Design a protein around this nucleic acid. Structure first.
Ligand SMILES: [Mg+2]
Ligand SMILES: [Zn+2]
Ligand SMILES: [Zn+2]
Lengths: 1327, 149, 49, 50, 75
RNA sequence: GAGUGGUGGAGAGGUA
DNA sequence: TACCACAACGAGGTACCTCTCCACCAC
DNA sequence: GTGGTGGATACCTCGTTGTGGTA
């Protein structure tokens, strides 16, 4: 009963018979009057066991005492009724038949096994054509398909020597006659002669098929079914309807069809029918059994009796409602309630209000146990009726049972990890689950009718797991970012803002108070309001370097409300925390500061107290909204009038015919957006600074106590866009086609729109509410795909001991610092030391966890970039170590070994899918005659260093773009030195002298023309596509020489001073001119969520940026074709590389410069396949992490980067082979990188040559299907494909992933169960 | 026009009046908006919504509990919640939620009897839906079995 | 529905995230007690006994 | 009778409930003046005038 | 540990070992009927075992040598 | 040896 | 023989609630 | 009642993956 591997293979007919318990021989299911099953029918109890518990059919034996006997009048075996759903039947098929999975699961494995096309095999099994099996004559070669006319022609020609058959018996005899080892030896000798790509691919596919067959020991004859098995009868059950009519499953109908046609084929075979009739019935039997194996697969799916397609066995296994993803991964469960949620503000952080009725139902056997333990209940029936009478002793027993026994308040859609939290319930009357107001941010709950489930834990292990792991007071910080998730939200925030804000001269300002106790006595007495600026004596507590608490005391000039909140704030925090007005961000920073200063206990009790006082003082304010509270700026209609007047003037100038339609429309756009900005600015000023009626200093201007502005300014609800839409101008709404409407909505939601503006607004409304449907569907599919990629990853080792890692810089791209070094590097474990002076020559040790103190010291020393241990760099097979992962965010300290990293990262990535001086580098240049610095290289980027030595900004400069500055100078802000030609690309030189116009003759490579403006002759070069016969074999070169004609030598190299220019170059310089060094020579002119899905699925984009593959000098290799081949010949070795470029696709590099290993050749987006293939793993991880965090940074979503590193580490599991060494790997086999690693480990252990390889980057779908855990791939997708291939190869599953251990039903190898799993695996290895 | 109507009614023209507090007697600091909004009551009643289940009916094919308030069934602890328990690490909670609280007849009978006797202990077993999957692949014609050790 | 007196202010958290706090007199006047008429059926089927 | 949530208004942008709340209070002010005139039983001419 | 078990986390070192050793102790109290050495104040066995580990009368190797000691004096 | 049927499946509508 | 349109299969969100409707034939 | 059983709709959108065609 203890298995440790699920072994799968094909089924021999002897194995199918040895499963079986008797042949079914009749299509009659049961009788219609006396509802017992028949003899040898589809439910026949002589085959599939008894019907009642310990009985026979005739009722002779009725007792356990006849444990197993055979009733002589019925033939049945008396057992328990469990064997009714565990016995199998077999069908003796008359003719052999084809398993449709091995015919239509592409590629069919028969079309690759017999090397015959699927159309020919389909025409054989459609009974339309014959194939000879063997022939002694020379006319008929082996496996030659013949039509019926050719068949009868062969009969009248020879008729005796050959044998041509038609149907599944023909391919069965062919599968018998095919010799596996002989044909694979023939393949191995026939492969090595020529190596063409497509035929070599088909040949190695066939060699892998044959080698898998001879490894597994299956027979190729076994693909043809001769004995079809029958499912147990209690899994295709028969319960009737309420009115006696019997409604079956689909499988009884399918089996009835195949059994009836098998009986008719039996009658026609022993009748010896004509061959046309018997082959027609064989056709119909074949079609019926192909329907049974997969209805909607071969042809017309046979529909049921109710005008719907029938469900086959494959349709009962695979699907969104198949067995796997419907009843194995997610099960309906006992001990579970559901109710409408409501708000309990009077709770604490760990409590929920369970109703009396649901709790009395859920804890019913616990109540039975306590009732029997207290001597009141003696039997189960008395306990049942005592609960169903609902006595006061039952209410007391329930009140004792509930006490500190948690319940899991799940909410679905449980998107991220914190959607299940366990609370200690308190009893309430009523009918609605009460939540804390802090956890309804984690749940994304709104109390407008959201329903939540209550799951109970039963065992002691589960109560301790729900107390110590899933409590609400343990998941304070989300695992997406170390910033707490119990933030006050909108009402506590309005209350704390109204507490800690201050007026000017409200009531009793300028008093001096002993402290918070006297201040709160004053406020509750009413002699001083909450906004009087006073002096208080605050005895704040500075916590020192160790855990000691000194007490300092001085006088602070604060508000009465801040002095009252300081009474709540515990001992250990400074006062500048509370000393300003507290918005939502300041309150969350209060909680985070309190966390990393004190711990987990005072932060919890401080969060509860801060919610209590926030609610109470929000109630004592009375922050109400009116129609006067949305003040409209009184200079709105004037600037609106001026804007419409000037846009009428521009429209009149267009209708006169001066300007054009596109420029007029863009003018309307910029006018109305500028007026919108003016109205919004005047609105926010006329809302922000309005409480000016003051006294006792003067008529002073301060920030306003307006209610709309207060609720938008504290961070409570809505922002400046929504306030602008209320009060100011609604703006330019958009048509659905991506356009902008000409006339904006000049009204707002206080004056009220007219008809036309509201009809305009409905465009954006319906576009948003269809956007949410498509957004949520695609985000859910991305989340499930990421989860089923990232199953196989857990913390396994304590340390992998490597020193590799990612050089981590603060990302600085664009125009602004995107992420600081703090939010980039905090949490990691340092790969090496910090070998730079900075300010103090700090050398932090390697393998060091980055605390906040260490982040502060490296920020003070201003280290430019740090190398850290990354998850993709780890050297542990089957999971990554702890030090390469770093800090677990939800606990603050390092990752405890066992915690399933991959599902954490999958939820935290796929969850916001519903939200969606100067420095020169790589420079070869020359100062020209004008001093304006040009650049002669392609990969030059301009850097902006700081006066500390770090970086301010970075920009990429194109080749030949001009630069006004030299190196090292400190240019001030406002100077844009970025100077570029927007349309053309320069082809500048670097030497000086005179030009000899060689290798260009007018007529076949250059066109004689003159510019129509200046009259100067220009010898422009024509492209090689329109040249004559004399221009198809030579490249024009501007032979730049000295004053006499000598081709000068460039110092450093030995190549001559020639410039192979391409076509479309506007050569304007003439002969006899002086050329400077660097002067111009000629001119040549030119979403979010699908972006994340396209980066993770690893697709090749629509315009692949072509890149270089090797170092060396580049030249052209093949001419006389529009596909220009490029010989990139190395400076030391030969070139085996060429390339095919499309005609319209241009080229950016020239054939005179030398590139490095993996240079950028063509521009645009580039595919992660080639990014990996030329650069390497650390570069492709940097690319994927930056490109995904661009999307999550634009929408404003905080995600720690090690999640995306985990997903890329799961994308990079495979590795294909460029050369074998001595291990058992042939060539190019997509095998797991861990097996290659341990194979090279043992080969270097015993001193061998080792096997080389090449990492390859698969997408999410191909990665999770290429996972060798076939249970994991079959639970994910393409179930017929993966079951067919695993059955062919004879695979076994090692049962090491969480998905297969959840299907099978043990503890998962993570979390708690990881200790048990390593104990069980060392016990199984130890004997 | 609304402020003209309010001036006819002898009311504060802005609509905001100065409410008191019935709890502690004293005054709210700022004027509160008060009027008469027309509240409905929708067809989502909490008596129809609330439902709980301890141990009840069971399906025929998969031997896991039913679904729906009419059949007194339990909440589906779906795939997303299985990932939530996985990424917590509550392996014992996930195992007891997929075997003894669900489709495993011997384990759930030992569980019910043990909870009534007071000792919360768990004897697991292979789930009935996994046995259904084994019978369905074996009837499809692919030999799948449980290899020991 | 019925029209009833409404104040727009936070009240000790009990109207937090789209929640409503209702006076006693709304219940005492029975302004919102609907009637639900439910049909239960009984059929005398016919077994063969 | 109902203490609603003021933060439901400014972000969700349904100002119709705010204007309807004011207009409802105006309607009940007029109805209350008519109820006062009837419970004091002033004059059918004063009722007609108001 | 009745509100936050972080003191027991600092005593053990790891949440999973905390759950395992507290489950061992709670099973010993519910099956074997051994006396909880902290005063119980009308609590359940799981929170009693967490409070035991939180105080410091029981760790993993402490419970292991205790069960081995009662084993050898039983045999 | 001591009561009892929807899940099954379709269609339509609704909630978060 | 290496690109290439073209065709075929295989995905497409979780949880919940209410109601009705269910093969023809036939000596 | 108890075995028998074959025909007159179209209205997704990618996105891989395999296949005959042709310069
Ligand atoms: Mg809601
Ligand atoms: Zn019998
Ligand atoms: Zn590592």
């Amino acid at each position: 009963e203890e298995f440790d591997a699920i072994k799968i293979a094909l089924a021999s007919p002897d194995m199918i018979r040895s499963w079986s318990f008797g042949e079914v021989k009749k299509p009659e299911t049961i009788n219609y009057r006396t509802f017992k099953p028949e003899r040898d029918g589809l439910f026949c109890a002589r085959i599939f066991g008894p019907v009642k518990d310990y009985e026979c059919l005739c009722g002779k034996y009725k007792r356990l005492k006849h444990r197993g006997v055979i009733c002589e009048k019925c033939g049945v075996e008396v057992t328990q009724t469990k064997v009714r759903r565990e016995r199998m039947g077999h069908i003796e098929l008359a003719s052999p038949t084809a398993h449709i999975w091995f015919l239509k699961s592409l590629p069919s494995r028969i079309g690759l096994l017999l090397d015959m096309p699927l159309r020919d095999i389909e025409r054989v099994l459609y009974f339309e054509s014959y194939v000879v099996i063997e022939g002694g004559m020379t006319n008929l070669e082996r496996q030659q398909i013949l039509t019926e006319e050719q068949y009868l022609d062969a009969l009248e020609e020879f008729g005796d020597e050959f044998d041509a058959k038609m149907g599944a018996e023909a391919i069965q005899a062919l599968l018998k006659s095919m010799d596996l080892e002989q044909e694979c030896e023939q393949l191995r000798e026939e492969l090595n002669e020529t190596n063409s790509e497509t035929k070599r691919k088909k040949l190695t596919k066939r060699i892998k098929l044959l080698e898998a067959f001879v490894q597994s020991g299956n027979k190729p004859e076994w693909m043809i079914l001769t004995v079809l098995p029958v499912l147990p009868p209690d899994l295709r059950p028969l319960v009737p309807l309420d009115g006696g009519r019997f409604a079956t499953s689909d499988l009884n109908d399918l089996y009835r069809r195949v059994i009836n046609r098998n009986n008719r084929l039996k009658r026609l075979l022993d009748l010896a029918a004509p061959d046309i009739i018997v082959r027609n019935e064989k056709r119909m039997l074949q079609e019926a059994v192909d329907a049974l194996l997969d209805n909607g697969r071969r042809g017309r799916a046979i529909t049921g009796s109710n005008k719907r397609p029938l469900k086959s066995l494959a349709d009962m296994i695979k699907g969104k409602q198949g067995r796997f993803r419907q009843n194995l991964l997610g099960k309906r469960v006992d001990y579970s309630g559901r109710s409408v949620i409501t708000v309990g503000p009077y709770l604490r952080l760990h409590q929920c209000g369970l109703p009396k009725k649901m709790a009395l139902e859920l804890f019913k056997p616990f109540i039975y146990g306590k009732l029997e333990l207290r001597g009141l209940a003696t039997t189960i029936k008395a306990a049942k009726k005592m609960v169903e009478r609902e006595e006061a002793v039952v209410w007391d027993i329930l009140d004792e049972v509930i006490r500190e026994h948690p319940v899991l308040l799940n909410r679905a859609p449980t998107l991220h990890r914190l959607g299940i939290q366990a609370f200690e319930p308190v009893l309430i009357e009523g009918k609605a689950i009460q939540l804390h107001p802090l956890v309804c941010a984690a749940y994304n709950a709104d109390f407008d009718g959201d329903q939540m489930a209550v799951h109970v834990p039963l065992t002691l292990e589960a109560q301790l797991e729900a107390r110590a792991l899933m409590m609400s007071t343990n998941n304070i910080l989300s695992p997406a970012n170390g910033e707490p998730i119990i933030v006050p939200s909108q009402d506590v925030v309005l209350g704390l803002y109204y507490m800690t804000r201050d007026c000017v001269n409200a009531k009793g300002e300028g008093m001096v108070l002993t402290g918070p106790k006297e201040a709160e006595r004053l406020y509750r007495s009413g002699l001083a309001s909450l906004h009087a600026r006073v002096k208080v004596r605050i005895t704040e507590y500075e916590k020192d370097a160790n855990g000691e608490l000194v007490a300092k005391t001085s006088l602070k000039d604060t508000t009465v409300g801040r002095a009252i909140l300081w009474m709540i704030v515990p001992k250990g925090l400074p006062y500048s925390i509370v000393n300003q007005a507290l918005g939502k961000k300041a309150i969350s920073k209060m909680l985070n500061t309190c966390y990393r200063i004190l711990g987990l206990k005072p932060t919890v009790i401080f969060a509860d107290q801060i919610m209590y006082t926030g609610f109470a003082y929000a109630a004592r304010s009375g922050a109400s909204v009116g129609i006067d509270d949305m003040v409209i700026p009184e200079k709105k209609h004037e600037i609106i009038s001026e804007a419409e007047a000037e846009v009428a003037e521009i429209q009149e100038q267009f209708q006169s015919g001066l300007v054009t339609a596109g420029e007029r429309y863009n003018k309307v756009i910029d006018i109305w957006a500028a007026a919108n900005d003016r109205v919004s600015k005047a609105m926010m000023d006329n809302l922000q600074t309005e409480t000016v009626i003051n006294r006792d200093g003067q008529e002073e201007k301060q920030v306003s106590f307006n209610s709309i502005y207060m609720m938008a300014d504290s961070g409570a609800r809505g922002s400046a866009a929504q306030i602008r839409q209320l009060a100011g101008m609604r703006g330019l709404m958009a048509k659905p086609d991506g356009s902008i409407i000409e006339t904006p909505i000049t009204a707002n939601f206080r004056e009220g729109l007219n008809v036309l503006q509201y009809f305009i607004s409905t465009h954006g409304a319906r576009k948003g509410l269809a956007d949410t449907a498509l957004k949520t569907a695609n985000s859910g599919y991305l989340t499930r795909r990421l989860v089923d990629v990232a199953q196989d990853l857990v913390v396994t080792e304590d340390d992998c001991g490597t020193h590799e890692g990612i050089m981590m810089t603060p990302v600085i791209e664009g125009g602004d610092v995107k992420e600081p070094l703090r939010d980039r590097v905090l949490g990691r474990v340092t790969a090496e030391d910090v070998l730079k002076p900075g300010t103090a020559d700090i050398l932090v040790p390697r393998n060091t966890l980055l605390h906040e103190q260490w982040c502060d010291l490296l920020e003070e020393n201003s280290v430019d970039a740090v190398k850290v241990r990354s998850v993709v760099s780890c050297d542990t097979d089957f999971g990554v170590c702890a030090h390469c992962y770093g800090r677990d965010l939800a606990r603050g300290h390092i990752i405890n070994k066992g915690e399933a990293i991959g599902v954490i990262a999958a939820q935290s990535i796929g969850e916001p899918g519903t939200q969606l001086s100067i420095k020169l580098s790589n420079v070869k240049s020359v100062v020209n005659s004008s001093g304006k610095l040009v650049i002669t290289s392609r990969n030059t980027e301009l850097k902006l260093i700081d006066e500390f030595g770090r970086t301010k900004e970075s920009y990429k400069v194109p080749y030949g773009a001009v630069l006004a500055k030299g190196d090292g100078e400190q240019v001030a802000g406002g100077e844009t030195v970025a100077n570029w030609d927007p349309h053309t690309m320069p082809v500048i030189t670097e030497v000086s002298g005179f030009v000899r116009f060689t290798d260009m003759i007018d007529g076949q490579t250059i066109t004689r023309q003159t510019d129509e403006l200046t009259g100067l002759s220009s010898l422009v070069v024509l492209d090689s596509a329109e040249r004559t016969a004399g221009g198809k074999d030579l490249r024009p070169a501007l032979k730049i020489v000295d004053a006499q004609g000598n081709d000068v030598l460039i110092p450093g190299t030995d190549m001559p001073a020639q410039y192979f220019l391409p076509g479309k170059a506007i050569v304007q310089l003439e002969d006899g001119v002086q050329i400077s060094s660097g002067d111009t020579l000629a001119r040549i002119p030119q979403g979010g969520l699908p972006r994340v899905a396209d980066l993770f699925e690893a697709r090749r984009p629509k315009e692949p940026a072509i890149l270089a593959e090797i170092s060396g000098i580049v030249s052209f290799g093949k001419e006389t074709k529009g596909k220009r081949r490029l010989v990139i010949t190395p400076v030391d070795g030969s070139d085996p590389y060429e390339e095919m470029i499309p005609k319209w696709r241009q080229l950016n590099v020239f054939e005179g410069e030398r590139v490095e290993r993996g240079d950028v050749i063509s521009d645009g987006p580039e595919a992660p396949h080639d990014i990996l293939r030329l650069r390497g793993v650390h570069a492709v991880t940097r690319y994927i992490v930056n490109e995904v965090q661009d999307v999550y940074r634009l929408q404003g979503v905080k995600i720690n980067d090690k999640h995306i590193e985990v997903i890329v580490r799961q994308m990079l599991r495979k590795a294909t082979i460029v050369n074998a060494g001595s291990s058992d790997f042939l060539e190019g086999e997509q095998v797991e990188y861990s097996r290659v690693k341990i194979a090279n480990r043992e080969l270097e252990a015993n001193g061998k040559v080792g096997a080389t390889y090449s990492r390859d980057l698969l997408g999410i779908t191909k990665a999770s299907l290429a996972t060798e855990s076939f249970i994991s791939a079959a639970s994910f997708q393409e179930t017929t494909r993966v079951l067919t291939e695993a059955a062919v190869a004879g695979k076994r599953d090692e049962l090491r992933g969480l998905k297969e251990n959840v299907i099978v039903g043990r503890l998962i190898p993570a979390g708690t169960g990881y200790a048990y799993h390593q104990d069980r695996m060392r016990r199984r290895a130890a004997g | 026009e609304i402020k003209e109507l309010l001036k006819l009614g002898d009311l504060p023209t802005s609509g905001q009046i100065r409410l008191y507090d019935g709890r502690t007697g004293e005054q709210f600091e700022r004027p509160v908006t008060v009027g008469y909004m027309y509240m409905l009551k929708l067809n989502h009643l909490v008596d129809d919504k609330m439902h709980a289940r301890s141990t009840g009916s069971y399906s025929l094919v998969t031997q896991q509990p039913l679904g729906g308030k009419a059949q007194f069934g339990g909440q589906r602890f779906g795939e997303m919640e299985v990932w939530a328990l996985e990424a917590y690490g509550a392996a014992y909670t996930l195992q007891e939620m997929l075997t003894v609280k669900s489709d495993d007849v011997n384990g759930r009978t030992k569980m019910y009897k043990n909870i009534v006797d007071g000792n919360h202990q768990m004897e697991p077993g292979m789930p009935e839906s996994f046995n259904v999957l084994l019978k369905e692949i074996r009837s499809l014609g692919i030999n799948i079995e449980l290899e020991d050790e | 529905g019925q029209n009833m007196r409404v104040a727009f202010m936070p009240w000790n958290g009990y109207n937090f995230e789209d929640s409503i706090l209702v006076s006693e007199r709304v219940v005492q006047e029975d302004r919102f007690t609907t009637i639900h008429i439910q049909e239960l059926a009984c059929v005398s089927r016919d077994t063969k006994l | 009778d109902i203490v609603l949530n003021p933060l439901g208004v400014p972000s969700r942008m349904n100002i119709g409930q705010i204007l309807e709340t004011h207009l409802g209070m105006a309607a009940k002010g007029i109805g209350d003046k008519i109820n006062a005139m009837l419970k004091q039983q002033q004059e059918v001419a004063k009722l007609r005038e108001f | 540990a009745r509100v936050t078990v972080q003191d027991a986390v600092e005593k053990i070192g790891n949440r999973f070992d905390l759950v395992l050793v507290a489950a061992r102790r709670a099973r010993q109290m519910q099956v074997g009927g051994k006396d909880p050495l902290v005063p119980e104040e009308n609590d359940k066995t799981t929170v009693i075992a967490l409070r035991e580990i939180e105080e410091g009368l029981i760790n993993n190797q402490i419970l292991d040598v205790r069960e081995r000691q009662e084993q050898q004096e039983q045999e």
